Design a protein around this ligand. Structure first.
Ligand SMILES: [Cl-]
Ligand SMILES: [Cl-]
Ligand SMILES: [Cl-]
Ligand SMILES: [Cl-]
Ligand SMILES: [Cl-]
Ligand SMILES: [Cl-]
Ligand SMILES: [Cl-]
Ligand SMILES: [Cl-]
Ligand SMILES: [Cl-]
Ligand SMILES: [Cl-]
Ligand SMILES: [Cl-]
Ligand SMILES: [Cl-]
Ligand SMILES: [Cl-]
Ligand SMILES: [Cl-]
Ligand SMILES: [Cl-]
Ligand SMILES: [Cl-]
Ligand SMILES: [Cl-]
Ligand SMILES: [Cl-]
Ligand SMILES: [Cl-]
Ligand SMILES: [Cl-]
Ligand SMILES: [Cl-]
Ligand SMILES: [Cl-]
Ligand SMILES: [Cl-]
Ligand SMILES: [Cl-]
Ligand SMILES: [Cl-]
Lengths: 242, 244, 244, 244, 245
């Protein structure tokens, strides 16, 4: 079935619920397979408008925040692809709907950050509410981007002009532009979410601001790394003349 | 053909096809027209469209843009991929649309596949159910065709191999990308402005027009990424030449 | 007083040509003048144009700009293509205009083709019907000549052929485009600012001024595209030379 | 309790040194702490600093930033050049500051020469006379040290001579400059955001904080200029090597 | 020769009068032109109750063009001009730091500005500004005027670029000059904007004149960007010419 997980956040101790749930209920989280044949009917049966279902399930996407009817919204985010035999910069997309007090998330390429949240819920130490769950999805994705950026930084710190074996600047640059494509929009999506004054944000104002600070830092770090690559390229030009 | 290509009536929930010899503009009708036909100005002016707005609508040169006019009226100009036999897809066609006294009037020089697909949907009685939806579909249809074309560019970039000279189609790619960008950036701003006007067409379908705007933004960011990829390959070639 | 080139009375919709020895400035009149004539300062100051505003109007150096002055008065400065025989077209002319006590006073040094066409139309009883329309026609006339010149640049660009050194005119085209960009970018903000001022000369024709603003924006976008084309052809030459 | 480096009381304008084992935070006190010490979290949390705030204060990665918190509370994060023995200057230190319940709590890992100088002043009974002044001195202190370091880069850049290959220290200068730029830009915004919050610590010294902000703005512009000079020298070298 | 105060003028009346250069109490409608590096200036400013930190900023080693609204109607305005003194380059621009304080204009210099000399000469001939509002306007426009004159010398260099004549290749020198100018002239534009938006009595009495001065500095900035664009193109000209032939 399309429903990977279902949790009830009616109390601070989330309880696991049937993956055969027919109706969307307030305070519940549904984590779903985006490409499964049955998800469209389930969403539409539950009165999610056709056009918003279409955007949520579309092949193409960018990180973005979309205010919808009365407290509802869509939030789309990207994460690093940590799956085996995958290109990490071929970033996964998580598409989230906050609809009638429920959080519905959709995935295709599995997210390590989301697996950690799921594992925490199973061990009875997960988020205490939907507001906190969304916060942890945002920060978990940030965290995994930071880890990937550390591997780029290692490659960059290896750049030695007198050593041609360390000339990996083209690969790093390719990785960095691929990430920048989505991580820049990610920053604006989190900004827009906050400015929306969603009950999920206004209950955790300082925490969402910290999340926004981290995504901003990530973007500034990418810019710096791109500058380092450019500098190394000129250092190679300068070494070829001496 | 006179100037009028096709005429649809949305004053019933199921749109009906009407005569192309309609002489008067009626609310909730869509008139699809040849911009370069000699008779179009006369028809527009006779139906009380001001001469100066007709002049902008029929101008040789244009850019995608939104123009609020009197009352609920507006002009919206957009570009699309050129899928016609003697042209290049990147020499994008201009579609100039007037929303006037409750009617939609679209004008073309060269046919648009987006608009053709809408006309086929209406003929099969499964097209847009209103002018609001119709304009929404025109915008999203143009996006979709731009996406399709961009996929073709992506394939070219994906075959870039520095070790293989025959794959060095990076200059062609860049030419195409910058030709698209020329118009697709103002397209984003036109759609933003349309939304911000609070047009009755938009406010009936607010989330859907927001989604269309998200898609044009994505397209622009995709073009920027591809232009980055092209610049990267050009460095990869240059840095290979000094070793090679 | 030899500084006055031509004087028109727009008090009626059929403008009449008047004497060039006009002491007092009258509302709804247009005075077209030689900026560098020794008698022009004295005429302006005697008609109560403040000295510092005469200083700016007549200054040696200028940029396209809009200046709200007091009491419905303003100064507008614009640039045009130099179409004079044996001139360099990118040696652009500057037209400096005062809207002052309900009169339009324009000043020239390098003659403008757009203004000559307006004067010719007036001589034939088909010129603008008001000062509001006249100013709009000066702006759009200048836009139009810029478009014409840009078309010649485009021709040059379409003839780029990497395998034909007789076509390697990219340095000259780049030179022309940056020289025009210098003034054409401020021109767009000048027109934006004119519209924002809510001048009676603009509020009478809101849609028309937004079209003029759209044309100047287009020109700027076209210039950026052409520069991108030049930059690409430079890269093309560098790739071709290193590959052959 | 070994996390606390120093503790001062600013209740009076003569600040007094207090015990390094103060379990409860008091208004008008300054606590300067080791960020990496395992006991800091517990002390902050026992004093009712929310866990997520502590999480951000103590995180591995940071950028300069201002965070408005509850009820006059805030977090400010700033960077400083690294003046520790044998360190890279551009391996910049991060100072993370909480203003919480009327107390200033600063946290360090890499020691700040600026903060050491403020501490020496307090030990010599000539330090800042309030928490408002202390925060101002921390900001301006960090700035001052950056200015001093940048003067060394300026010397290096002025000694550059294209005919003397021993003066080619511009790429090392460039490495330093981009690394500093990375954080110095966010620093300017953090200080702007601090001022815009209308914090009691700022509104008591409004002109002083404006001057501090002008200084960081100047630092940014100077770095941009030095980066421009470096680029210029590189082109100078390219142009000097390709003449042979 | 020996003192901090260079000149003192009284603009109480439309015909300014030269007054004593003795370190006294400042008066509304007076202009005090001073040596910024003289040991005595800080004491005078503080004796006259200018706050310590404002004095620190005014007399600081480093500066950028900027506008600083202070208490009441007071402000600080910092500007840069061409350095037309010997053993300096024109592009090593001088900082002129100006305080409007209790209705007096206090300007400070390190090295002479030709713009301010010309105003001082006009005052001496009884043909100078008739008010502090006009004085400050003339300082701003005077500084613009001299930057324009220098930019003309750069234009001369540029117009003489000829790709087939290596003796004309002074584009490295020109670009260095331009980025050095741009460093300060960009902030100067914003400082003048900021001064205008403050609604200072010195600005509101001459609203169109100060806008013309703002238009002039904006024009200067655009001209600089254009010349920088011409230097980049001449670099492309050379590069093409070199490996084509
Ligand atoms: Cl996405
Ligand atoms: Cl995915
Ligand atoms: Cl997942
Ligand atoms: Cl993840
Ligand atoms: Cl943001
Ligand atoms: Cl168009
Ligand atoms: Cl077309
Ligand atoms: Cl069509
Ligand atoms: Cl299409
Ligand atoms: Cl937009
Ligand atoms: Cl001009
Ligand atoms: Cl002229
Ligand atoms: Cl003329
Ligand atoms: Cl013309
Ligand atoms: Cl604009
Ligand atoms: Cl930091
Ligand atoms: Cl640190
Ligand atoms: Cl420290
Ligand atoms: Cl420090
Ligand atoms: Cl700022
Ligand atoms: Cl300065
Ligand atoms: Cl100085
Ligand atoms: Cl002086
Ligand atoms: Cl000067
Ligand atoms: Cl400005």
């Amino acid at each position: 079935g399309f429903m990977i997980e279902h949790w009830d956040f009616s109390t601070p101790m989330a309880t696991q619920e049937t993956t055969t749930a027919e109706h969307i209920q307030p305070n519940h989280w549904y984590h779903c397979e985006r490409l499964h044949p049955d998800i469209r009917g389930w969403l539409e049966d539950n009165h999610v408008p056709r056009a918003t279902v279409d955007h949520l399930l579309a092949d193409e996407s960018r990180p973005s925040f979309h205010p919808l009817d009365d407290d509802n919204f869509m939030l789309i985010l990207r994460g690093i692809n940590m799956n085996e035999n995958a290109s990490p910069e071929d970033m996964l997309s998580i598409r989230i709907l906050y609809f009638q007090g429920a959080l519905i998330s959709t995935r295709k390429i599995p997210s390590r950050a989301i697996m950690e949240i799921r594992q925490a819920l199973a061990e009875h130490k997960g988020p205490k509410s939907l507001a906190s769950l969304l916060n942890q999805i945002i920060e978990g994705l940030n965290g995994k981007i930071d880890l990937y950026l550390d591997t780029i930084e290692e490659t960059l710190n290896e750049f030695d002009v007198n050593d041609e074996s360390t000339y990996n600047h083209i690969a790093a640059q390719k990785a960095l532009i691929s990430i920048k494509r989505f991580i820049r929009p990610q920053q604006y999506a989190i900004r827009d979410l906050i400015e929306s004054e969603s009950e999920l944000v206004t209950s955790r104002p300082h925490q969402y601001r910290f999340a926004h600070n981290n995504i901003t830092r990530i973007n500034e770090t990418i810019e710096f790394y791109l500058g380092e690559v450019a500098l190394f390229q000129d250092e190679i030009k300068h070494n070829r003349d001496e």
